[PDB]
Nucleic acid binder design. Structure first.
Ligand code: K
Ligand code: K
Ligand code: K
Ligand code: K
Ligand code: K
Ligand code: K
Ligand code: K
Ligand code: K
Ligand code: K
Ligand code: K
Ligand code: K
Ligand code: K
Ligand code: K
Ligand code: K
Ligand code: K
Ligand code: K
Ligand code: K
Ligand code: K
Ligand code: K
Ligand code: K
Ligand code: MG
Ligand code: MG
Ligand code: MG
Ligand code: MG
Ligand code: MG
Ligand code: MG
Ligand code: MG
Ligand code: MG
Ligand code: MG
Ligand code: MG
Ligand code: MG
Ligand code: MG
Ligand code: MG
Ligand code: MG
Ligand code: MG
Ligand code: MG
Ligand code: MG
Ligand code: MG
Ligand code: MG
Ligand code: MG
Ligand code: MG
Ligand code: MG
Ligand code: MG
Ligand code: MG
Ligand code: MG
Ligand code: MG
Ligand code: MG
Ligand code: MG
Ligand code: MG
Ligand code: MG
Ligand code: MG
Ligand code: MG
Ligand code: MG
Ligand code: MG
Lengths: 259, 186, 183
RNA sequence: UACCUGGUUGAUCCUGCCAGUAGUCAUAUGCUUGUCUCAAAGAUUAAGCCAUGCAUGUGUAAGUAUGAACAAAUUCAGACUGUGAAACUGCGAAUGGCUCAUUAAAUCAGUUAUAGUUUGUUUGAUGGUAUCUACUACUCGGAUAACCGUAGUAAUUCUAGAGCUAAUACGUGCAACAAACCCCGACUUCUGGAAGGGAUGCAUUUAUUAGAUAUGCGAUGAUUCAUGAUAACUCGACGGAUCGCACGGCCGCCGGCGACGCAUCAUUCAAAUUUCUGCCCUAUCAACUUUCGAUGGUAGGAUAGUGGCCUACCAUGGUGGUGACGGGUGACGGAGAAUUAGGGUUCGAUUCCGGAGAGGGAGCCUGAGAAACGGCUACCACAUCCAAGGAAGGCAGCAGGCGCGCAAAUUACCCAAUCCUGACACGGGGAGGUAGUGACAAUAAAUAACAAUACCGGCUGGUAAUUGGAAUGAGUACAAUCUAAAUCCCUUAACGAGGAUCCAUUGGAGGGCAAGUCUGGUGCCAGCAGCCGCGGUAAUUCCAGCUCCAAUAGCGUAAUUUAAGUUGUUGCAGUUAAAAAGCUCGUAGUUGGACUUUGGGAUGUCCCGUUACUUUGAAGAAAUUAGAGUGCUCAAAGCAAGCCUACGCUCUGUAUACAUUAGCAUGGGAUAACAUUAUAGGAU
RNA sequence: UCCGCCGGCACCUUAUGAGAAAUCAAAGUUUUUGGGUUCCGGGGGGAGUAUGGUCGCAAGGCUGAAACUUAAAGGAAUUGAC
RNA sequence: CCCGUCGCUCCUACCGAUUGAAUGAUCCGGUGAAAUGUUCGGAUCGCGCGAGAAGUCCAUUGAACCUUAUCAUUUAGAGGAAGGAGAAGUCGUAACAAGGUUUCCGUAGGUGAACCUGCGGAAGGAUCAUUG
RNA sequence: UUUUUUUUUUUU
């Protein structure tokens, strides 16, 4: 190519969007934004495919251009706006507040939240460094930059951010014994407590996580998001509480429900 | 035009490479500046990748040169080019390139020395006291002192005139000054 | 790109390896005549389906008894066979899947069932009745003889409500004859 | 899903192939063709050449209206505040679509790196010194479009003068006001402090300096890294002379919600280069590269940046039977496709990913991004128009035409769906969809069912252009439905079957291989026959009639797989079937004897150098494959959907598995490989 | 002369072995397929021919195709005929 | 049963004068459009200054062409000479029996043709055998 | 150990 690609073929869309194979030749290409294209959920999918408020692309645009949808307390009129992990989606007209979280199967789920819970969100810190004039600052994995951060905060920690004031109200250090959710890989959407951390010089760090039922799994450091201090998450989890159920037990539950 | 690609080169084994694509604009090269010393200053503006700017110096007359030992930087005049390590011909043409050895006017540095140390190479009591205090640690390289007599100082160009449009540098000192003086005495 | 290109399709039968086996020909003709099939392709399609199911069961039986994949797929296959009436509750082991014959699948055809419950005087009569829209499984009219009837749907087979044999509005021949006799 | 059969002989057992049998999301052709649902389609030969039409434009309250444009108002005043064409300005056109020519460690796949760079835009943060003695900031200056009117030319979004008038166009310019830090410094109650002056935003360039950590000081595995401070430097496209809504509080000053725009960092969308391992045939290719870069070093230039990328000087290096170099490919690579005991064999132009190209080369402007071709410039080859003076070109985009061939469709409709793009909720989109042609390929499925009578065989079955009424879709058509509008499908008034003329075909009948020692003709002729063989006057084999057989809306005929243990690693052969060099030596290669910690007590636990290999984990696009669920009437499919009709619910579902080699991490230390051992220069 | 050991050229008998057999005590220990290693065949002809290379004074040696053609050619053994 | 020359028809390749021809890619040398950078130049335009066209100078990238040579893929050719196939051609009888001179391998020579002969070799011999 | 050449095509 001679420059940036503006189209996304439907087969090339991320699988967790769950787009029909014969729905069309194209999928909504995520716009530039706080979240990466492969790790986002465009507002068009949320409003049309998931919530079914809009029956078409045109209806999605019509709904959004009325300034009726807010992301992180800010009105967004971009259909392909990348809304990702921990983001808050609010529709004041319908009195609906949603938080984007990964289900046990690794797909974004619109988790309904209370009004109080909709006033804050969690962020993961990438690094802390000095800006111009020697002013310290940190940036999160959702594109945010915060100046004069708490000196105790460091990379890979989780900060509680108040959307109304855009200030850090609390933070969690990345350490063993903290409940976390996996945001990538085959174990995406699972929730557990860190057991130990393996660090290799000049290589990715491995994190070992134990599920509430005792199941053990490991993942990379960049795929681990801390949800609270100790074993109690700071936000409400979706249905299933990040517990991955084997296909056999899922089938047993389905058959039991059938009768 | 000028290309920086490796397609035209040979393989490390010595075999020939067959073309599989045309030249790309992102691997281009441009003509050298060949900056010279002339009273008619001429710096050209170049629009480069990303919309950024480069400055091509065709002729330069003055430069920003620093005295390392004294931590003093002054704008002086470049007199001539004496030594060039890459190519001897670049000295005959008075080409201004990085790391070239040039002679610069010593007048600004002489003035600073006179004003600071009160020495040539009315006044208030406080100024006299200040100069006397500075006089305790006044140590001058004899070679630099002999250079100051002729009004010219050997210097090395530390900037790239063809990229930034300035012939800045520093004054030679110590072992480097001795090395280049020995190389010039021939 | 043409989005239609992404739809996939597959074959449903294979031709015999040896075209002219006399014993195979005799057996196939016997089955076709007994079940009133239109050609050997239907029998070969049923054989293809049976072979696929038997191969799946045989593959599963090779795995360890405690293998989760074996457990899951064996339960799925046994449930599938039970839903369509191929296997009885007592036949609750994958081993009994290997003992399935083409006749078992043929006995589940809507044509065979329609003949058996007594709605047709013959298998061919059942075929013509089905293809003429006189038969419904539940509330849905079915005109495909190859329709495989599940155990639950077996007892709902009845005449179409819009057909002469299930409701009113006799056929065009009867109406024409009645009109002719009116004079 | 581990299979064979005919053919050498008078007969036999072999080797061995030929022939047959089955398959191809495999091309083509022949005959035939009623219905429903899917669906490939000028790749192969010519990346050959192209008439004509279309395929890229774009407007919000929010840059610029005096159309001599339309509309409503104003009786008197009014800069304009309703629509606004045209035009300037801005943005886009570097995406998409098409094709596979070139290209053999190259593209490319997996796996790395940028501490070696650029990145319009989106998202989050961040903007303090300009005039200093001119002195608009209650707001600077000069043009030009549209318009208008003098035109030239055969002629083109070919073109020259003349008269106006705008800006978020162009060029300037106060840039609301400070502190702190540093230098010089008169003057001075003088180890001091002091008026005054200089410097001081952000950015650039070069120097000095800090950036620790066996009473302050950030980050990495690792950086004189982030960042701070000083001296200066640059004739700096920076630091708002912009626009829409409203309409308010103090005593003219303050004041909200937005739009657009400039700069810095981070982020996102990406690129460029890059690490390791991996590619078909060929030795009738064994040496290749190094004047003129080949391998490396030093210093420079250029680049967005690393680098012989280029220059100067220096050294003689670099690859190679572990196959370099050279050649061929009817070679773009991959995801994948066909066939499936296992191992394997063959294919991969084509819808997803990556690369390349726009007739062949080369060069380049604009721009964040192009060495762009529905951009420009030149040459080469083709080629249209001309009033002969000139002027215009690029279908391997959608259609369509010529040519080529065995070989491939309409010069149609539409932005309704999917999505992209612009100033933009609105425009545009031959991307894409709809419909047309379409026996590439795939799915379902008609051409009859039932009684009476008569014949036959044991109440029970079979046959009958004999009789009898019933059923129905192919077709036809109101209507509705479908649809962007149509059409088709689905539904359905009135019609629509007896030789149910609403008439099934393609190949065969000696064997392989299912089916006639039937009848007529021909007479080694004509012909058949994949192979073996038929035909010479009594032809199951030719040409025909009858009958019969196989498949069936399909079947016949003309590269590739299986069968092939006839390429053999699993797994073949070499005495006589084809085959071991006349003999020995011998370097590469391959292979290589044995030996070093066992046992009990107990109870996973206690006692007495470098690799191969194996276990486990992470990560490893989708589509395709396997596979869970789900009555599109079934099915191929699809990703749907189910209860009940609640102004709803199931947080509805949209699982899971697989994945050579190579890389990353982990446990084991049997079997193996390389290295080492004693002139002690050894261990402590 | 007799009894033994090692090494060698062979011979006779035998099958529990192999083999299509003829035969083989190695042509055995092979569908119960694997000790190491070199060469080398892939139906019959065209053909050890053409072309290129290389060696040789020459004769020729070594390396070595294809187009095309064809259903057998061929091994062992049995009976007969001669 | 069988071998060869000779005789007829057809098919396939091979050699070959023509200092053969075409195309593609590299090699030696030469010319060299266009563009870019540089030097000079100054029609003309605004307030002694600033901007600046045509043209010109030397370099860089470099199409295109000409010369030399080498590879790769095709292709014409008077004529010459090989092989194969085709029911009933001519001359012999070389191979099969001890095939009537046992056969065959290498080498050399010679004859219409099969073939004959010399030297050494093999049994795939027509002898597994003379302690006679 | 004198001399002894030859037998059209297909089929039975
Ligand atoms: K296709
Ligand atoms: K425009
Ligand atoms: K643009
Ligand atoms: K790669
Ligand atoms: K530190
Ligand atoms: K490759
Ligand atoms: K570089
Ligand atoms: K170098
Ligand atoms: K390629
Ligand atoms: K741009
Ligand atoms: K076209
Ligand atoms: K549309
Ligand atoms: K037959
Ligand atoms: K006759
Ligand atoms: K006859
Ligand atoms: K026959
Ligand atoms: K003889
Ligand atoms: K003989
Ligand atoms: K003669
Ligand atoms: K004959
Ligand atoms: Mg593209
Ligand atoms: Mg097999
Ligand atoms: Mg015979
Ligand atoms: Mg090609
Ligand atoms: Mg590589
Ligand atoms: Mg950016
Ligand atoms: Mg630094
Ligand atoms: Mg360098
Ligand atoms: Mg491909
Ligand atoms: Mg091709
Ligand atoms: Mg195509
Ligand atoms: Mg592609
Ligand atoms: Mg291109
Ligand atoms: Mg063309
Ligand atoms: Mg061109
Ligand atoms: Mg181009
Ligand atoms: Mg075009
Ligand atoms: Mg284009
Ligand atoms: Mg076709
Ligand atoms: Mg078909
Ligand atoms: Mg019919
Ligand atoms: Mg038969
Ligand atoms: Mg006859
Ligand atoms: Mg006949
Ligand atoms: Mg063999
Ligand atoms: Mg022989
Ligand atoms: Mg032999
Ligand atoms: Mg031999
Ligand atoms: Mg040898
Ligand atoms: Mg052979
Ligand atoms: Mg004879
Ligand atoms: Mg004789
Ligand atoms: Mg003889
Ligand atoms: Mg004779």
């Amino acid at each position: 190519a001679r420059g940036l690609k503006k189209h996304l073929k439907r087969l090339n869309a991320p699988k967790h969007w769950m787009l029909d194979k014969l729905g069309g030749a194209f999928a909504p290409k995520p716009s530039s934004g706080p979240h990466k294209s492969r790790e986002c959920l465009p507002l068009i999918i949320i409003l049309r495919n998931r919530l079914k408020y809009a029956l078409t692309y045109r209806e999605v645009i019509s709904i959004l251009m009325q300034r009726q949808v807010m992301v992180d307390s800010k009105v967004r009129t971009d259909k392909t706006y990348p809304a990702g992990f921990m983001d808050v989606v609010s529709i004041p007209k319908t009195n609906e507040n949603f938080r984007l979280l990964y289900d046990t199967k690794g797909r974004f789920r619109l988790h309904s939240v209370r009004d109080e819970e909709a006033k804050f969100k969690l962020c993961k810190v990438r690094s802390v460094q000095f800006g111009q004039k020697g002013i310290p600052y940190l940036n999160t994995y959702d594109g945010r930059t915060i100046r004069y951060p708490d000196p105790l905060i460091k990379a890979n920690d989780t900060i509680k951010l108040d959307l109304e004031s855009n200030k850090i109200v609390d933070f969690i250090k990345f350490d063993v014994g903290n409940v976390v959710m996996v945001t990538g890989g085959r174990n995406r959407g699972r929730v557990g407590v860190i057991k130990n951390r393996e660090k290799h010089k000049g290589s990715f760090e491995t994190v070992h996580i134990q599920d509430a039922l005792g199941h053990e799994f490991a993942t990379r450091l960049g795929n681990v998001f801390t949800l609270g201090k100790g074993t109690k998450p700071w936000v409400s989890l979706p249905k299933g509480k990040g517990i991955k159920l084997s296909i056999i037990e899922e089938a047993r539950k389905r058959l039991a429900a059938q009768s | 035009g000028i290309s920086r690609d490796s397609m035209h080169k040979r393989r490390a084994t010595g075999g020939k490479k067959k073309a599989w694509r045309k030249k790309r604009k992102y691997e281009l090269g441009r003509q050298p500046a060949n900056t010279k010393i002339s009273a008619n200053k001429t710096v050209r503006r170049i629009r480069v990748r990303g919309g950024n700017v480069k400055w091509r110096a065709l002729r330069l007359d003055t430069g920003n040169y620093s005295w390392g030992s004294e931590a003093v930087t002054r704008k002086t005049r470049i007199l001539d080019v004496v030594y060039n390590a890459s190519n001897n011909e670049l000295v005959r043409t008075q080409t201004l390139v990085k790391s070239a050895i040039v002679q610069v006017d010593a007048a600004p540095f002489k003035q600073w020395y006179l004003q600071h140390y009160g020495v040539d190479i009315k006044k208030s009591n406080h100024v006299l006291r200040k100069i006397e205090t500075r006089q305790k640690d006044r140590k001058l390289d004899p070679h630099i002192e002999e250079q100051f007599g002729g009004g010219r100082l050997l210097a090395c160009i530390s900037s790239r005139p063809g990229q930034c449009g300035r012939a800045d540098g520093y004054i030679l000192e110590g072992k480097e000054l001795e090395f280049y003086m020995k190389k010039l005495q021939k | 790109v043409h989005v239609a290109f992404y739809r996939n399709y597959g074959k449903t039968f294979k031709k015999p390896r040896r075209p002219y086996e006399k014993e195979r020909l005799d057996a196939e003709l016997k089955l076709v005549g007994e079940y009133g099939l239109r050609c050997k392709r239907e029998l070969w399609r049923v054989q293809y389906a049976l072979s696929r199911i038997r191969n799946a069961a045989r593959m599963l039986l090779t795995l360890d008894e405690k293998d989760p994949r074996r457990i899951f797929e064996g339960e799925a296959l046994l449930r599938r066979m039970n839903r369509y009436g191929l296997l009885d509750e007592s036949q609750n082991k994958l081993d009994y899947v290997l003992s399935l014959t083409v006749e078992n699948f043929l006995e589940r055809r809507l044509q065979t069932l329609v003949f058996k419950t007594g709605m047709a005087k013959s298998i061919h009569h059942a075929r013509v009745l089905i293809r003429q829209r006189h038969i419904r499984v539940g509330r849905q009219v079915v005109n495909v003889p190859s329709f495989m009837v599940r155990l639950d749907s077996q007892k709902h087979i009845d005449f179409s409500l819009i057909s002469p044999f299930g409701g009113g509005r006799p056929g065009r021949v009867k109406r024409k004859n009645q009109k002719a006799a009116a004079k």
